[PDB]
């Protein structure tokens, strides 16, 4: 017994309030022309923050007692599977609560209402059941690779000057990842150099570290060595400290012991032909002089996350004590070199034999737009990956929602009435989305509704809400499309979680003690 | 507030304003001369206004 | 705190509050989508009354201390002279007060702005000059008999589905009325039967009453008797006393005396040939039986208003004591009968010698709303009488108001000095009327104003507000026109009414506490 127990009427109300408060702020964000927003807070907060992406701001704060923190947290799980496209999942989730008030009028069992969620699955068949959707996204595809959903994702975002080009690039990244496989090892780093392209495509993995000023500029027929244990030696356990000996005469044996570590590393490193060494942690200075003469490039304090991906990439190896060289380690050999990108110096690993993992490097001018580049690419990788394998997409800008709303109204009559009562209420919910999209760009909400329904009911799936127009227009010309996964997944997120609000009996976490 | 419908609709005016900004320019002839050096239009003009 | 002391700006405010309070109730009443309001009181009032006409509701009640009742009284004279159409005159005077807030922004001598009232007259001359009127009113007329002004009055009312056909009928009614007669004897009653025409025209007068279930079904060569006094006899105001006689034997005389009333009524009535007796009040039970055997139809509690019109119709009679039969009574004779009008029994008085008085009994499609015909017919009577006398009209739907408004904006800039501010404020007053007409239509008021304004500028007097459309259209095609008299008088009245009290600063004290 936690202590917070709510039953019947009161429990439902707390849930009802959380959804409406968040819906108004998120609405302006949606669509080709969204609005950038700034928030101010006091206490462990410094000033105003602006985030185009709805998910990032919700994640950062747990403002109050009412239940909404768990729903918000869930969206990130959604973000990884397909995520965003444009933020809209929160909006759909909020609207099913409005008919809850009419539920009391039915006055029977809220739990059997839940079977409606099962019917939500039914909504998935009816949503894609009639009128139209796209039919191509065949594989690779010469012109449908982009200039569609990715453009829409960033259209809301301010960066859509230079950035719309960046988005187009992302589908190219999925093409190499194309086939069946893991959504793994795709790395993107923004850069401070300036160019029209604002981004470059690499055929391998990008890293940014150097051995030191001395050492050859590049290596050929490169071999890669990764070690778990550090190069550093002296401390062991219970140091036997710096200590001192009967004068300076016996200090010499100490230096000599060090020399043995130096020689072991060169003698068997040479047989392999070692071209590059990557170590995650502090590196011992002695080997650095030796590597330069040999013609071997090493990396100091390499990050572990890069290393784990790299192992999958080069066939891997076994990392342990200095015995690790030769056969116990496998190295790919296309070519490793440090290349000036345009401004900063970076090191490129490429030509991996496996081919499973690849890396993307973004440059950009050096402003807010570049920081939000991070926002956009994370958003882009998941949408495009789904687009290649889904084979299905829908028209954006509310086209899907009005259409679905007509489809759903017919079916309540079709199904038996207890089931029908639940289903019909769900059907009117879709009406609010058209209303939300028109209001954000300007023009009054119901005039749009009159004209909007008539065009969709006509049978033209292409037609949608043209915010710039103020009325209705052809969505396809705009190039706004939604991935098939985003539409069904939002319905499920709106579903199941909404199913419960009696069952949970506990809602929020703040942070560590 | 008395308008009582939609302040967002009103925003259209700012977009209008960019064109309006160019109503100041090319919408009427006024003067323009002030070439350079100037005999009678050299002063007995702007300095007096600041003045 | 409290004392009713007024200082500079506050005194101005009292005039200001009266204008705004009246305007909100009145504004919704203007035009096709006007609204009906219902008013009730506990005593010296019996039920809620709903008045569509703005002028009628204002006249009956003086609710509070602030001045406004006298301003209201002005529309009466206008109504008897030209009449109605739609009530717009009161609203225009009220909006003149809104600029006053900007007047303190002047931070100067408030009464030189009074020159605006001297600009109001200049505005008045142009109204006469610019509007486009009409040419033609042949008399009786074939096609131009209607489909004009009656329709505009009707436009303000939602009956304009089948009703515009009814309005067209009304001119036929006015053609007989036309001329010398003035306004009298027009009576309208609904019928519960559906038909395309929705109305019928009768040569005579319909009264809904019956003597009793028994009595002759029909009378011809009918003679009509109207009595100011009831058939009831027993009190006399001064009782004569409780009374003393000579025991029970003579009181038989009292009961017998009742019979004498019966005897006079039969003997004298028979000689005339009496076919129908109409009495305005309660009728004594004894005579009722006599009428049935004789072959005479009498009417119990026939109301007076029908009777006065009826008297003009039959040449009348002098109504007095039972001596009333024969010559002092003049009974026109054609046909008096009770006729089933398919639905409900009514009595038809017809074949009137005078010809001046006639009845417009309309049938029409049923619901509570056919009582609307009562509302609507009254409007028809007032507009046609003026339309025939004036032989002049202007375009309705606010077409007149926008045209004049475009012209006045130019005028303000042209006049030098003190005068433009005064002139421009009068000028922008006209702008609100398009807005008032649009707002009640349910369409967005802002959108409506500029599109309307652009069409007027072209030079199309015909173009105006189309509320049904939701945008702008050609008023002339609609057939909506306003009589010439309403526009010239209102301009003179509006300016002068608002003008006096601005002039006077301070409604002063009293003696009491």
UniProtKB/Swiss-Prot annotation, chains A, C:
Cellular component, GO annotation: cell body; chaperonin-containing T-complex; microtubule; zona pellucida receptor complex
Q: Gene3D superfamilies in the record, alphabetically?
A: GroEL, GroEL-like equatorial domain, TCP-1-like chaperonin intermediate domain
| Chemical reaction(s) catalysed | ATP + H2O = ADP + phosphate + H(+)
Q: What is its EC number?
A: 3.6.1.-
Q: Which sites bind Mg(2+)?
A: 84
Identify the CDD domains for this entry. Answer: TCP1_beta
GO BP field: binding of sperm to zona pellucida; chaperone mediated protein folding independent of cofactor; chaperone-mediated protein complex assembly; positive regulation of telomerase RNA localization to Cajal body; positive regulation of telomere maintenance via telomerase; protein folding; protein stabilization; scaRNA localization to Cajal body
Q: Which residues bind ADP?
A: 31, 85-88, 155-156, 397, 482, 487
Location of the protein in the cell: Cytoplasm
List every position bearing Phosphothreonine. 248
One Gene Ontology molecular-function label:
unfolded protein binding
Crosslink position(s): Glycyl lysine isopeptide (Lys-Gly) (interchain with G-Cter in SUMO2): 235
Question: Membrane-crossing residues?
Answer: none
Stored Pfam families:
Cpn60_TCP1
The top EC class is: hydrolase
The family database entries (InterPro entries) matched by this protein are listed as: Chap_CCT_beta, Chaperone_TCP-1, Chaperonin_TCP-1_CS, Cpn60/GroEL/TCP-1, GroEL-like_apical_dom_sf, GROEL-like_equatorial_sf, TCP-1-like_intermed_sf, TCP-1_chaperonin
Name positions with the PTM N6-acetyllysine: 141, 168
Assembly mode: Component of the chaperonin-containing T-complex (TRiC), a hexadecamer composed of two identical back-to-back stacked rings enclosing a protein folding chamber. Each ring is made up of eight different subunits: TCP1/CCT1, CCT2, CCT3, CCT4, CCT5, CCT6A/CCT6, CCT7, CCT8. Interacts with PACRG. Interacts with FLCN. Interacts with DLEC1. Interacts with SVEP1.
Summarizing the function annotation, the protein's role is:
Component of the chaperonin-containing T-complex (TRiC), a molecular chaperone complex that assists the folding of actin, tubulin and other proteins upon ATP hydrolysis. The TRiC complex mediates the folding of WRAP53/TCAB1, thereby regulating telomere maintenance. As part of the TRiC complex may play a role in the assembly of BBSome, a complex involved in ciliogenesis regulating transports vesicles to the cilia.
- Member of which family? Belongs to the TCP-1 chaperonin family.
Spell out the protein name for this chain.
T-complex protein 1 subunit beta
Task: Tell me which species this is from.
Answer: Bos taurus (Bovine)
Lineage, highest ranks first: Eukaryota, Metazoa, Chordata, Craniata, Vertebrata
Q: Which gene encodes it?
A: CCT2
